[PDB]
Design a protein around this ligand. Sequence first.
Ligand SMILES: COc1cc(Cl)c(-c2nc(SCC(=O)N(C)C)nc3[nH]cc(C#N)c23)cc1OC
Length: 207
Amino acid sequence: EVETFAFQAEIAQLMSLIINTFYSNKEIFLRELISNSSDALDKIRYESLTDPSKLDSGKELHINLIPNKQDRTLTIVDTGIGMTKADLINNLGTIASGTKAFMEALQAGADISMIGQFGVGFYSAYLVAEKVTVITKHNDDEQYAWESSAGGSFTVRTDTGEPMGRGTKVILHLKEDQTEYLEERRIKEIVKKHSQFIGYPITLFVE
Ligand SMILES: COc1cc(Cl)c(-c2nc(SCC(=O)N(C)C)nc3[nH]cc(C#N)c23)cc1OC
């Protein structure tokens, strides 16, 4: 039922740097996740141009932000292109993106806020999350769950959870000390500051 993979060496090093570097400006993780969702939405919008039945799995292109204070989770959901199983394993840990360029940049005076220039911004989720779960559904495949609490490994399984139409869900199990990012005022503040021109509706769920 569950396959366990080692991250490629430089991805493991990147995650360790993100988890262990003292760096207080953590709110930047949201912008990076929201940009990755916007890109995934662009991709399905593009393909649906030449093949309209690609949206049989849902026409609405949007991003939802779902805080849950009981579970201590912040969930970013899109109806983007999604990923196949092979896409998931290839893009989320078995390959290196500006992974090397980012880590060399940090030693030449870049700072962690610049991670998105390097195409590895997804890993800034580890500034605020002790565990990340990615649930994804591509038109070409079944629904899969990737998961990692860092420490060098991740898992992939077929997802038995709620069948989504198509897209990706990023579930952040936040660290004990990072529950500010479940607060409605805080989330609105961050989206307004960093993601205010994203070209899809961003809906902040209430509790
Ligand atoms: C490890 O780096 C990534 C991780 C993920 Cl999960 C995604 C991603 N891909 C996808 S669909 C595939 C895609 O867009 N590729 C570029 C492969 N949708 C997403 N929605 C939120 C995302 C985030 N973070 C997300 C995209 C990433 O890099 C661009």
